[PDB]
Scaffold this active site. Structure first.
Site, short mmCIF file in Angstrom:
data_model
loop_
_atom_site.label_atom_id
_atom_site.label_comp_id
_atom_site.label_asym_id
_atom_site.label_seq_id
_atom_site.Cartn_x
_atom_site.Cartn_y
_atom_site.Cartn_z
N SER A 1 0.79 -1.22 0.00
CA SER A 1 0.00 0.00 0.00
C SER A 1 0.83 1.27 0.00
O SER A 1 0.26 2.36 -0.14
CB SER A 1 -0.95 0.01 1.21
N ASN B 1 7.50 8.80 2.13
CA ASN B 1 6.21 8.35 1.64
C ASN B 1 5.09 9.17 2.26
O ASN B 1 5.32 10.18 2.94
CB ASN B 1 6.04 6.85 1.91
N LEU B 2 3.85 8.75 2.02
CA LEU B 2 2.69 9.45 2.55
C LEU B 2 2.59 9.37 4.07
O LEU B 2 1.92 10.20 4.68
CB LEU B 2 1.42 8.90 1.91
N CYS B 3 3.25 8.38 4.68
CA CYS B 3 3.25 8.24 6.13
C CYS B 3 4.57 8.66 6.77
O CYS B 3 4.68 8.64 8.00
CB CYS B 3 2.93 6.79 6.51
N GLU C 1 7.59 7.34 6.95
CA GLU C 1 8.51 6.39 7.57
C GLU C 1 9.30 5.56 6.57
O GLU C 1 10.22 4.84 6.99
CB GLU C 1 7.75 5.46 8.53
N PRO D 1 2.42 4.13 10.95
CA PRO D 1 1.44 4.53 11.97
C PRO D 1 0.58 3.38 12.50
O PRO D 1 0.25 3.38 13.69
CB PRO D 1 0.58 5.58 11.24
#
Ligand SMILES: Nc1ncnc2c1ncn2[C@@H]1O[C@H](COP(=O)(O)OP(=O)(O)OP(=O)(O)O)[C@@H](O)[C@H]1O
Ligand SMILES: Cc1cn([C@H]2C[C@H](O)[C@@H](COP(=O)(O)OP(=O)(O)OP(=O)(O)O)O2)c(=O)[nH]c1=O
Ligand SMILES: Cc1cn([C@H]2C[C@H](O)[C@@H](COP(=O)(O)OP(=O)(O)OP(=O)(O)O)O2)c(=O)[nH]c1=O
Ligand SMILES: [Mg+2]
Ligand SMILES: [Mg+2]
Ligand SMILES: [Mn+2]
Ligand SMILES: [Mn+2]
Ligand SMILES: [Mn+2]
Ligand SMILES: [Mn+2]
EC number: 1.17.4.1
Lengths: 683, 287, 287, 683
Positions: free
Chosen positions: A164, A375-377, A379, A575
């Site tokens: 993802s 990335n979008l998170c 990490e 997360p």
């Protein structure tokens, strides 16, 4: 109002001055007995249920066919042998409303928790019945939790991609921008978050084909990406999520940040695109000395040097760029830019902050490339190589795009079972299987990098829950001592499993020979420093578990030198948003936001106390907003020294904290080795 | 000693009629007799006229002659409430409950009604007689304003309150209660300013000012009696309303620092039920 | 055609000083040079003094002479904003940034300042010259009012917007932005009332009113240039402030239905960052 | 103020109650003598000028290398021998501001009208000196005007494509949508206008991979395309312009039309995308009878029948779709939709109207495909085949896109020189050369269709100018008689030239054998009917020119049957806006909007009388808004019967006209065989 909701709402009804935490067990029991047992599709035996699920296009028959039905029955019996019970209403509610398989009409429950776990274990084992039983024990014990994509989609015909997280490099050309838009839409269609690096795009006001002031900058590409992510909304249930990263030394940095201002004009606002900024040590040095800084036009640098600005070392090239007349730059105030970043993060929580030098001073694969964005998170920190998408009928130069499939260790359950090594190795094997079974048909660089790098992300969750349930303050030195020892052990065993996999398969990841694992520079601190707990209380928590010593790390270093490493990246702490409820664990390694989580589902509100919350440990469940963010930074930096990738690090700020407090927190994080800062959450 | 607290009270009471949805009164309105609806429309129209002149003329003119920026700010705010909030709210009520022709007719009716014209003539005449730097003409206009705020509105307020107290027309009634809450503080404030001027006078002059106030009250009262009978006889309530206006006349006198003039009477219990960014320093980069 | 629409926009923009906490401005105020602090104080006092004239005279005098209940209500609302909201907001900013003695001295200086006085008295002179039932004198005052609301304030607004666009004095800059947003709509509204009068005039009278407006603009503009150099040369901004004055002069003219006087110029980017259906009848298908 | 501008402004200053038209000649002379001669670079000889232009990257050296310098000098002398003089200030101003080559700083003039004409002629001749001289004579006589792209860019190194109109078919898939966005951006980067057919996209609320209600419909793709065109706005020199076409029977028709409502929300509103509607005769029949109509979901039809809705015959398949339970449809009011179209056109001028059955009842290449949509100017009507763009590493099924290079006959100059045949044949040769030398390497369908169909558009201009200068009313039957004869002759000679080219090259266009030219059905009306002028006055206009008879048409039919046709499409009357000033002609075949055109250039206002305007012809220069739109429709239908493609037909409406009048005009145009309606202009 359902009975289980009534029981759960009794949590907040204080009796004798204390919360009625025991109402949650009653709430979950009533929820099951009155909704789940009733709404569960009935099958006479496992054979009939499996035949129905496969026939009706629910379960893929490819993975199930690898096992004789006796093996599948044994695995399912192993899953049910534990008699697993959800300890709170929220965990079971989350599972049976998000992950439990439901009929096409979404009216009945086809999968129990045990059925889902058994299916995931069978998918992981790839025909190994004993491996499948080990996976069933690992997940039913809740020591390891596969990420939401893998957990939800594994073994499902309708399933989307098990990966993802996607990172895309965008080259400075219309062909590359169009390909990036297409790939972003393709990956969002699969439900994965897509992060793009815009630092290679030339700034606004640059020339296209010796025509000056023609380029629209990174903000036009950002508008295109925002529209693309809005269009590929994944049925609309989960809106398309994309992140754009820009280097702080890019010319368009101010316009890049202005897209997130509420006062920004609607033709410039980018609603659906998260923004991260990559900050080299040079910018922090310039702001510290109050020196005037310059933002450069990337195409002028590329023309002058034949390489991209973000492909160069700014700490070595900044003075050359400033002194080079052929390089175009405009002056900025680094401290004003830092204050603007703090103000924007307070207003909207953006942008994500990536400290490039913190990431790359410990990066093991700098030879492949430096980590240029996240990335979008926030990490994922891996080497990427940009692709060269040429004209139609022209061969493309496929680079490396970053992707990793995620998994989380349950720290509380891993420590209770004293199974750090076994859990880590099984999680590594499952992540490797997910990586090997992924094939992206419209992201050539993503697929090539997945094949070559074999990057996996093994995170952890329930750090705060475990600490609070053991009488340890999150900000206390003992908490950092435990985190240091535990994540050192996790890194040791993940490296050992990666080396063992490389030995068994006979192959390492592409360009492993130039990595710091191959040269041994990675193991310097582990062979020179002892990471055993320094407190007796912490050392007792690890009793019954072997804590690797400097001799063990020397042996592992020699073993890696002999056999190499199968994964270019192994550990990243994502997360772990919604799957934490199922595991009844706190989210990731962050401190809890609230002691009791009040949420409204439908027209009835539900209360979720933090797992293990009670009167005795109420004070140890300190909320993040009440915590000293410097101690949180210290804990994250302690963990980060054993994570090869990044850690999603949310800042929890009180409304009374000024922009100077946020700037100081960011500066302390950069000073302490923090690689990325995810969000600025204000109470 | 008081303007600041009135300033704070006035601004904290700020409201708009659009905050109150009126479609809930549609049925209890439909159910009233033709006589009741007629009296109700006319009552609110009489109120609209009073607020129109209080907002257009009364409050702005008093603001012009009263010294002090804070006193002027309070009076300006009160003026705005009169015509931008109060007078307009009545049109919100009319537009909900009544067809355009009935609305047109009631506004035509205010123009030709002799009691409503007389009371407007008397009150506005006193406002327009104020002479710059002449405190006596100002006092007389402030007495007129207190009588408008604390006495004259009440022949009108009776009926919405009478319905509110029976659980009828409660949304319109909510608007009216907000208007009444405002007028009560407006009457007190203007009363205090009037007392300031009165207290500067000789005993002989004071005696004349009391005569003026009482003569004016009686003249307005006698006209209000005829107005009340004209509106309320068809709904059977004239005697009850008369008791209410006498009650409020005493409150107006008290707002002016004078003794009550009418004897106490039992008011209909229904009507009683109707009531940050900081810069980064060099030390911020070291730990 | 327009008063109810402006009523709506005005009342929905209602705000109070207390909503913005001012104390956090001290964290950037302390880092400004003496010339920056001096200019800011002087500009602020200039705006305060001009806005007081508008609250005490400008808006109430126009409300007095304009016919129409709904227009009087909107004008009352605008006067209220000047006296109850804007004036308190300016006072709050001052009390936060300077001690009492410094405030008194700045106001003494700005009160004696030749360029501030010239424009303040020119505007006030036109308000004092309005005659009952004379629409020409009313129009001239409306022109003066539009010039104040849409033009004269902007040599002052420049500086708070300049800081606001840089991340400095954000709390007081937010307040100033709300004030400016009110003055913009005030200028547009009064402009429409002036055009109504203008359009009732003969062609010769129109040409005469145009000459009046341009002549007045010229006098005010030449004084603004001097005012600007007097305040902004010490902080090096006068060139850019002059562009902002002309740009806002053009807006003021457009509010009065007149053509722009000055050529179009770009504005400082920091200040910018601070800122007949008919149905087919079954025969149309046959030919 | 410039002296020439003051002289021009004297045009409007009435003297003796008459406009001072002679002041424009003085204005143009002053303009030249005071600005053009001063700012014209000086070159000692033509050899030096050519060397300077080639070396300084102004001209493409390849095309000039096909001629000995003696031949180039002869061609330039031929261009200069005419001593061409601009008759008005606006002609020279437009040429020297838009098309005259200027130094890289845009400070000096490097090309005169003769230089540009000579360069274009040498580019056309492709190494033929006599052919180059013929082209020079054609252009300098102003009998033929190459389209703005060809005229501006021919022979220039830093030039865009000579073709500026492209039509793209979009298939119903994410790959196809992304490829469409990429192709649109690539084509707008080249300066060409892009029209996209969205009728094959499924409507909002359709299933994506057996998941219902997942599709965003054509409006989401419209937002994507609008942002793509805004981004690729030609380096800011000309905002990217695109057109979207949707069949009226598409379910998204109402949402598609609502994107052009002023009250439309900014989320749905599309700002820079033109919209056209394709109306089959079935919709007009339904509206005429007031019967309830249905709009269909395209994907349900595709699944039920295996073909796209716009690929099928609506007039035949409408009842089958309505009676098919597996086809989803939405009830609509056809007359309400017609009135909505009329009101939207009155408010904004959109959408464009394409009468599909009018286009295809005379379409010569229905075997290749039906005509489904038009271009951004609504005069391109060609068969297209949708491409199938697959996943990366798969082979794409490249279809046929649409593109034609335009040129305009100057009707007044052609008639004055009595050179219809020669002018038409030379224009056909030049358009064929432009098509042959065109190669778009980022639009595979466009390149393939250009190579296979060899489509050209030969337009005409100065119809109203020529008629008014000859004492003929635009709305008179004599004007229609002249248009009939002239365009019959143009069609005859273009067909003859196409057949001659096919014979010379021994090759026709792809699938010619199935065309109506091959079977002879095209020539039925020409062999059975006579098109010589029916009025003696019009017949005199053609004195000295041979008007083809029925025998001539029979001979041409036999010749085509023997040799075939080189061009699938030959004639299309594009709006031809910018170059009409240079040619001193009325735009296209439309009537003049205003007798004298008032323009603002900087702070100076320029006055442009209609070419040839004078006191004696003032009445014949009737403005379009004062004409009967029924008579304009009659004129366009008379012309359209000899054009194989469409005619860009603008409607000029008075503000008093209701939506009913616009609907009546549309219905009369549909009745009269009009193919497309371009714009609804209101006065
Ligand atoms: N908290 C829970 N989490 C998960 N499943 C539950 C939970 N509570 C009940 N169930 C499911 O509902 C069934 C009935 O629950 P209940 O507590 O009544 O069972 P029981 O008859 O007492 O025995 P057992 O606990 O062995 O099932 C359980 O067998 C289990 O399948
Ligand atoms: C075509 C185009 C490009 N761009 C931007 C996006 C790309 O990052 C950048 C380069 O475009 P390119 O597609 O690379 O153009 P080019 O390679 O032909 O020209 P050059 O070699 O000088 O770069 O320009 C626009 O902003 N608008 C446009 O219309
Ligand atoms: C992926 C996606 C498609 N669409 C629309 C655009 C396409 O025209 C249409 C089909 O998408 P496709 O790309 O064709 O998806 P698919 O082929 O896998 O599914 P199917 O078998 O049903 O064809 O769906 C969206 O609106 N949003 C999206 O996110
Ligand atoms: Mg390039
Ligand atoms: Mg598809
Ligand atoms: Mn009132
Ligand atoms: Mn009052
Ligand atoms: Mn003000
Ligand atoms: Mn104002």
């Amino acid at each position: 109002v359902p009975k289980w909701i009534q029981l759960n709402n009794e949590i907040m009804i204080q009796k004798d001055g204390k919360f009625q935490f025991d109402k949650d067990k009653e709430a979950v029991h009533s929820y099951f007995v009155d909704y789940i047992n009733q709404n569960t599709v009935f099958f006479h035996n496992l054979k009939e249920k499996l035949d129905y699920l496969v026939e009706n296009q629910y379960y893929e028959e490819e993975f199930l066919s690898l096992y004789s039905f006796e093996d599948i029955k044994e695995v399912f019996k192993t899953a049910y042998a534990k008699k697993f019970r959800f300890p709170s209403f929220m965990s079971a509610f989350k599972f049976y409303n998000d992950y439990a398989l439901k009929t096409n009409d979404k009216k009945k429950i086809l999968e129990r928790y045990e059925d889902r776990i058994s299916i995931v274990a069978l998918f992981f084992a790839n025909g190994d019945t004993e491996k499948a039983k080990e996976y069933v024990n690992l997940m039913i014990n809740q020591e390891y939790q596969p990420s939401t994509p893998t957990f939800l989609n594994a073994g499902r015909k309708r399933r989307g991609e098990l990966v993802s997280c996607f990172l895309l490099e965008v080259n400075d050309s219309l062909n590359d921008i169009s390909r990036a838009i297409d790939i972003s839409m393709q990956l969002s269609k699969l439900g994965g978050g897509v992060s793009l690096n815009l630092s290679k795009l030339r700034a606004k006001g640059e020339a296209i084909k010796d025509v000056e002031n023609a380029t629209k900058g990174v903000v036009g590409v950002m508008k295109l990406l925002d529209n693309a992510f809005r269009y590929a909304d994944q049925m609309g249930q989960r809106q398309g999520s994309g992140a754009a990263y820009l280097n702080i030394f890019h010319r368009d940095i101010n316009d890049f940040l202005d897209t997130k201002k509420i006062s920004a004009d609607e033709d410039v606002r980018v609603k659906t695109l998260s923004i991260g900024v990559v900050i080299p040590d040079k910018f922090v040095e310039l702001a510290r000395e109050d020196k005037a800084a310059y933002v450069f036009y990337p195409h002028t640098i590329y023309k002058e040097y034949g390489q991209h600005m973000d492909e160069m070392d700014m700490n070595e090239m900044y003075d050359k760029f400033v002194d080079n007349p052929r390089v175009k730059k405009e002056k900025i105030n680094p401290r004003k830019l830092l204050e603007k970043l703090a103000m924007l993060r307070s207003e909207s929580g953006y942008p994500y902050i990536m400290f490039q030098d913190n990431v790359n001073k410990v990066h093991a694969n700098n030879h492949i490339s430096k980590v240029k964005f996240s990335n979008l998170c926030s990490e994922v920190l891996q080497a990427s190589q940009v692709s060269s998408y040429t004209d139609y009928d022209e061969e493309d130069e496929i680079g490396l795009d970053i992707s990793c499939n995620l998994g989380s260790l349950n720290i509380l359950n891993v420590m209770e079972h004293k199974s750090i090594e076994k859990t880590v190795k099984l999680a590594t094997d499952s992540l490797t299987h997910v990586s090997e079974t992924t094939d992206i048909r419209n992201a050539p660089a993503v697929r090539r990098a997945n094949k070559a790098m074999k990057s996996i992300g093994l995170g952890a969750m329930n750090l705060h829950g475990y600490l609070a349930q053991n009488g340890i303050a999150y900000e206390s030195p003992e908490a950092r001592d435990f985190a240091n020892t535990f994540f050192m052990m996790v890194n040791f065993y993940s490296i050992q499993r990666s080396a063992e996999i490389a030995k068994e398969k006979g192959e390492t990841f592409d360009q492993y020979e130039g990595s710091t694992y191959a040269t041994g520079e990675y193991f310097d601190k582990y062979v020179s420093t002892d990471f055993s707990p320094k407190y007796e209380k912490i050392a007792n928590l690890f009793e019954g578990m072997h804590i690797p010593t400097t001799e063990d790390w020397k042996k592992l270093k020699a073993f890696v030198a002999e056999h190499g490493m199968y994964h270019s990246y192994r550990l990243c702490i994502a997360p772990t948003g919604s799957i934490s409820y199922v595991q009844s664990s706190t989210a990731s390694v962050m401190p809890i936001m609230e002691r009791i989580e009040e949420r409204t589902y439908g027209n009835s509100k539900t209360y979720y106390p933090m797992p293990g919350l009670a009167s005795n440990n109420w004070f140890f469940y300190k909320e993040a907003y009440d915590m000293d963010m410097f101690k949180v930074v210290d804990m994250i930096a302690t963990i980060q020294q054993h994570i090869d990738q990044g850690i999603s690090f949310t800042l929890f700020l009180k409304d009374t904290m000024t922009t100077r407090d946020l700037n100081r927190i960011d500066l302390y994080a950069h000073h302490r080795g923090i690689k990325t800062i995810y969000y600025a959450r204000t109470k | 000693d008081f303007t600041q607290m009135f300033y704070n009270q006035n601004v904290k009471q700020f409201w708009l009629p659009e905050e109150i949805a009126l479609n809930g009164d549609l049925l209890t309105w439909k159910y009233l007799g033709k006589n009741e609806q007629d009296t109700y429309m006319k009552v609110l129209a009489g109120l609209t006229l009073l607020d129109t002149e209080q907002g257009n003329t009364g409050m702005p003119i008093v603001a012009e002659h009263v010294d002090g920026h804070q006193r002027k700010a309070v009076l300006n705010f009160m003026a705005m409430m009169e015509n931008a909030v109060h007078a307009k709210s009545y049109s919100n009520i009319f537009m909900t409950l009544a067809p355009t022709e009935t609305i047109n007719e009631v506004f035509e009716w205010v123009k030709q009604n002799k009691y409503l014209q007389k009371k407007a003539q008397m009150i506005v005449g006193l406002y327009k007689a104020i002479q710059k730097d002449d405190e006596i003409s100002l006092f007389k206009a402030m007495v007129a304003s207190v009588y408008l705020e604390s006495f004259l509105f009440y022949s009108g307020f009776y009926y919405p309150l009478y319905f509110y107290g029976q659980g009828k027309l409660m949304q319109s009634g909510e608007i009216i209660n907000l208007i009444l809450r405002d007028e009560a503080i407006h009457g007190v404030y203007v009363g205090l300013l009037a007392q300031e001027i009165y207290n500067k006078q000789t005993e002989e002059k004071k005696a004349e000012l009391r005569e003026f106030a009482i003569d004016l009250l009686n003249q307005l009262y006698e006209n209000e009696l005829e107005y009340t009978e004209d509106l309320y006889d068809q709904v059977g309530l004239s005697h009850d309303v008369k008791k209410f206006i006498r009650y409020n006349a005493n409150k107006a006198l008290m707002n002016l620092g004078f003794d009550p003039y009418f004897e106490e009477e039992d008011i209909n219990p229904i009507v009683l039920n109707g009531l940050t960014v900081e810069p980064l320093k060099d030390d911020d980069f070291y730990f």
